[PDB]
């Protein structure tokens, strides 16, 4: 297998703008949304068909109750953060928990929090400590660190339970997450500004999104400014990317263990 990941996000907004829910919590297996919950629906629903098919009502039933409580803790934890910072108006609270099951069988785990879209607390599962960015984060840190049971549980979840779910979902969504759709690469040459010749290496219709693209001169890497295009969703479950140079040259693409070379 390639590198796969599980993640759950939480967003808490104080004093929202009529339409914006007070709380939203979304799960992903890689680039794919898998679960959704919000303060409006007050329910955990699937965001992938293979999630709906492989999880019984008892799973959605339980986690729905769990999320209502999580929603409540977020409201209180955000209010208290604002009280420390002496902040009025609308402010955001965020959380990200997750794990990666690496190509080589090795695993990683993350749990971090943010206030106003900026790093607030960052959990260290190796030292069982919280990394505080300021003195407000430091007060929450001292408090959180007092409950050794919760820290140990958080380590066990990230290290064991998380990877276990990720492995379940990978199987559930095997046909989607594990497939490989090779890229359609092309090179475009154009006399732009008088003299300047711009070469475009454009790739499309590939899955997974992770692609590597570079330009090389005579065989060696370009000691010139390569402009890179973002890996964007095509909207059909496939992705598109590019890389340009200002000019022999050859475009190099690696995607899903296959190397590609396009000379000019």
């Amino acid at each position: 297998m390639r590198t796969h990941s599980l993640r759950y996000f939480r967003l808490g907004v104080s004093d929202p703008i009529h339409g914006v829910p007070e709380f939203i919590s979304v799960g992903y297996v890689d680039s794919h949304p898998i679960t959704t919950y919000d303060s409006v629906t007050r329910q955990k629903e699937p965001r992938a068909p293979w999630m709906a098919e492989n999880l019984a009502p008892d799973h959605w039933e339980r986690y729905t109750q769990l999320l209502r409580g999580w929603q409540q803790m977020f409201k209180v934890e955000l209010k208290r953060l604002q009280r420390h910072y002496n902040h009025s108006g609308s402010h955001t609270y965020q959380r990200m928990i997750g794990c990666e099951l690496l190509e080589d069988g090795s695993t990683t785990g993350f749990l971090q929090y943010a206030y106003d879209g900026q790093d607030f607390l960052i959990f260290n599962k190796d030292t069982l400590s919280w990394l505080a960015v300021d003195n407000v984060a430091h007060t929450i840190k001292q408090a959180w660190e007092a409950n050794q049971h919760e820290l140990l549980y958080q380590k066990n979840w990230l290290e064991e339970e998380c990877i276990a779910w990720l492995k379940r979902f990978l199987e559930y969504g095997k046909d989607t997450l594990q497939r490989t759709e090779p890229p359609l690469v092309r090179v475009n040459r154009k006399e732009t500004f008088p003299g300047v010749t711009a070469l475009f290496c454009k790739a499309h219709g590939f899955y997974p999104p992770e692609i590597y693209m570079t330009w090389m001169k005579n065989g060696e890497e370009i000691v010139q400014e390569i402009d890179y295009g973002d890996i964007l969703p095509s909207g059909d479950g496939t992705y598109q990317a590019w890389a340009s140079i200002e000019l022999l040259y050859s475009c190099h693409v690696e995607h899903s263990g296959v190397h590609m070379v396009l000379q000019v």
């Epitope: 109750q65 409580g69 049971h149 919760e150 140990l152």
Partner: antibody
Framework: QNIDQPTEMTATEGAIVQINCTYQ??????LFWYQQHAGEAPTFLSY??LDGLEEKGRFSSFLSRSKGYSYLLLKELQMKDSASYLC??????????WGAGTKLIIKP | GVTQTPKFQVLKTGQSMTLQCAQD?????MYWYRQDPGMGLRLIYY???????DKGEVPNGYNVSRLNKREFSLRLESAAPSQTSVYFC?????????????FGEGSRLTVLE
């Protein structure tokens, strides 16, 4: 799924007793031990999620996540230790699954 | 901590019944259990936080109401002799609980024809 511990155990006062608890569950988020005197409310003894032994006076709790088992060790047994000992495990859906309890009988 | 009333109750088959539970500790989660001889505690109903409740393992014959953050009352609508058990009201800081689960004194309820 199933949490199993002995129905009853008997040991002599002043000796040591080890109460075993095996969890056959779909996932694991921590194991608990509760004390319950005849006709009284249960009380928290310990919570174990990571591997190892934890001493709280005459009472110790051990967990082996690989072996899917934990024990309660009572050293220097007293007549006051005559109670039931309930173990309970948390599955991947965060639900507590309680064992039937171990009635500890101490012989004076 | 957790105050639960009554300690004992005698009911006739079909009588309504309400068991009270209240907590001082500012806990968000509250639980209703029954303890029957030969088996592990069975969750009847639970409240993960104020403003929500859900079915436990044994919800038939019962209903709950999380009145506020402190009270979680159980209700037996039509008592049945199967409902003869020891009811334990419990509370914890949050759900899921990795901390101490606090139990009420217990309620011995006996249902007869």
């Amino acid at each position: 799924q199933n949490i199993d511990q002995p129905t009853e155990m008997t040991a002599t006062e002043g000796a040591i007793v080890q109460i075993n608890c095996t969890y056959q569950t779909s996932g694991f988020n921590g194991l608990f031990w509760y004390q319950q005197h005849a006709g009284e409310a249960p009380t928290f003894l310990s919570y174990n999620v990571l591997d190892g032994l934890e001493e709280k006076g005459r009472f110790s709790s051990f967990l082996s996540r690989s072996k899917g088992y934990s024990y309660l060790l009572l050293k220097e047994l007293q007549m006051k230790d005559s109670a039931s000992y309930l173990c309970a495990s948390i599955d991947s859906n965060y639900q507590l699954i309680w064992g039937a309890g171990t009635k500890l009988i101490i012989k004076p | 901590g957790v105050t639960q009333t009554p300690k004992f109750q005698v009911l006739k088959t079909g009588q309504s019944m309400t068991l009270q539970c209240a907590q001082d500790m500012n806990h968000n989660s509250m639980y209703w259990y029954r303890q029957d001889p030969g088996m592990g505690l069975r969750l009847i109903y639970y409240s993960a936080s104020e403003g929500t409740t859900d079915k436990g393992e044994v919800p038939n014959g019962y209903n709950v109401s999380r009145l506020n953050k402190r009270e979680f009352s159980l209700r037996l609508e039509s008592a049945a002799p199967s409902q003869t058990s020891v009811y334990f009201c419990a509370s914890s800081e949050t759900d899921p609980n990795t901390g101490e689960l606090f139990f009420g004194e217990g309620s011995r309820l006996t249902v007869l024809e």
